[PDB]
Protein: nadph-cytochrom P450 reductase
Amino acid sequence: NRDIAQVVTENNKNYLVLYASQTGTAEGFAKAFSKELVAKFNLNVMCADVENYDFESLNDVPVIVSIFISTYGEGDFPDGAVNFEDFICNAEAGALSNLRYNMFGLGNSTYEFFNGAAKKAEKHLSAAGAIRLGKLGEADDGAGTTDEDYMAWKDSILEVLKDELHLDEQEAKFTSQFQYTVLNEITDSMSLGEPSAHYLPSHQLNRNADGIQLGPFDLSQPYIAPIVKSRELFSSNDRNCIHSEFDLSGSNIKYSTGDHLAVWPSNPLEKVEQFLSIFNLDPETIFDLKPLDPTVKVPFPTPTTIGAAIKHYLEITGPVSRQLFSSLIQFAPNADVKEKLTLLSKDKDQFAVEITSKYFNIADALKYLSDGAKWDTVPMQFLVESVPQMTPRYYSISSSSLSEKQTVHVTSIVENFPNPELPDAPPVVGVTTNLLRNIQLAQNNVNIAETNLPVHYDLNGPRKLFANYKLPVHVRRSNFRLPSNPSTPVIMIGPGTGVAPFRGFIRERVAFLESQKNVSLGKHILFYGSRNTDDFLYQDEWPEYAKKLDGSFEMVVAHSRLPNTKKVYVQDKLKDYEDQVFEMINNGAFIYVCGDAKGMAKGVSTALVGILSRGKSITTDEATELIKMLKTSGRYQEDVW
Ligand SMILES: Cc1cc2nc3c(=O)[nH]c(=O)nc-3n(C[C@H](O)[C@H](O)[C@H](O)COP(=O)(O)OP(=O)(O)OC[C@H]3O[C@@H](n4cnc5c(N)ncnc54)[C@H](O)[C@@H]3O)c2cc1C
Ligand SMILES: Cc1cc2nc3c(=O)[nH]c(=O)nc-3n(C[C@H](O)[C@H](O)[C@H](O)COP(=O)(O)O)c2cc1C
Structure:
């Protein structure tokens, strides 16, 4: 049931594919690998998420095992796989003597401890007597080769397994893991986009005395919340950054300052049409899925309608995998298209040249190859099993839980830029952020027709559940936390939207200090950065905070795109203030680093190592050593995405 060795064996599984994924990138790969393993060798594969089983009986698995693992924080596994991680990292010598395995790890050489989770896992497994088949995969998200790195690894590993298991190959064909059935009418027990089953009429939400919706909210059960206040934070005519405030009072959701909110999106309507159209699918088509065996888990709530699945369940937007092309060879519209497809599916460069570079979505790519010709010979089941599941997007809460107990503010820079290849094509946009903007404009009664909103969304949702600008959401507890003692000095470094956590930190300290109106607040310094003065987040708030925190606060701003001047980064300002900074560090100061800006984590860490190197007059190595210590002792925290 939860005993891995037992489940494999009880379902006569030939192969075991395991995956530890947060954002669901490994999940998707693991699944692709399984489908190909079944298409080519007919093997009865089990594709399990390492968080739904108890690997104590791992050494009793009579089948070869593939492990897809991602990396987060210090080279470590993704929360929600901590169990799996512990089993593996606390495995004694000769504890996995029977385990034959191969693994593909996902990473980003932009971080330190690049793919350190897969690396760590591999180090323990071998040591626990487990033999590794084929090369250790290593996807580099930083270099944007993740998908190709897989393709490469995948092919080699398949030759490794063809041998080890003496498998006879066969032209690869699709084999649904479900029993696709087409219903005739919609019920209160059938979904139309509802986040989870609990929100279907036939089910009852679990409230309490005063109706407060209860239950634990997470990836399996969100909490539809109403954005009670929105506003634009920028003032540029190109970029946009929305500030959204969610009212969580209607539930029993508590959150700590420095946590994360996960927003569950819905595809933009213009993109939903495109998908439906190129495949010639009927939105209304009611269908249902029946797992063809115990280990198969239905992807979303069913029954449901095809349009409800393409608008709420599948990630119909994003980079097209070459492997997806290779999988569509079967269902190619005509012979000429079936041809172009076969070539692109094998030539890495051609695929990048004809597809990747143009920023195509699946719909677009397919339309491109077919010149409009519809792929009406593709089964919804294929799509359900071939298009990545939609996933929630995380945000760093910018509100303090001390002064906003049940209100969560979210600072979200909008992802919407012009296609660099096709000047005439629609901008490359991001689902969730442009969604939040739509709600920001709508809610604020702005003639959207005027604005530069690239797309729009169903703002009523499933059975008007999202009625009144509400979205599925849930809090993800983190370890980004202000020092226990208020007296402790604090150093916060966050460029762009990376200030979101610190807004809260500051609001938290400002709130606390007024809860005394005694306590002297240790020094707090925030190093902010942004292009110009149009993208200066909460510019008007900071001065107001400084009044209340007096000489306990200090903000240091760097701009990188001011006309007629040198480009300035926070790590530049750190060295300018290397004495104030070095002193604080010698005072038990805590160092917080948050933001995106690829290479900003390493850069900032490297500036600190230098501030330390110079300060204590030590080598650059000793200094990086001291910095690794701060990161282990929790004095140096990071929230870099
Ligand atoms: C722990 C954590 C904390 C975070 N905190 C914050 C925060 O405080 N603030 C914040 O703004 N973000 C934060 N993020 C980032 C955020 O979760 C999302 O990455 C961001 O909002 C983008 O969302 P989206 O819906 O636009 O993305 P998606 O729709 O998934 O798009 C991603 C990008 O791909 C582009 N794209 C679209 N189609 C294609 C295509 N066919 N080919 C290639 N590219 C394409 C989009 O235009 C976009 O730029 C955080 C992430 C994590 C993991
Ligand atoms: C918050 C965050 C932290 C990360 N930390 C690391 C890291 O320390 N090392 C690394 O190689 N990659 C790191 N990555 C990148 C992931 O390993 C990479 O994006 C991978 O594709 C994620 O796959 P998943 O969606 O299956 O989790 C990080 C990504 C995020 C969002």
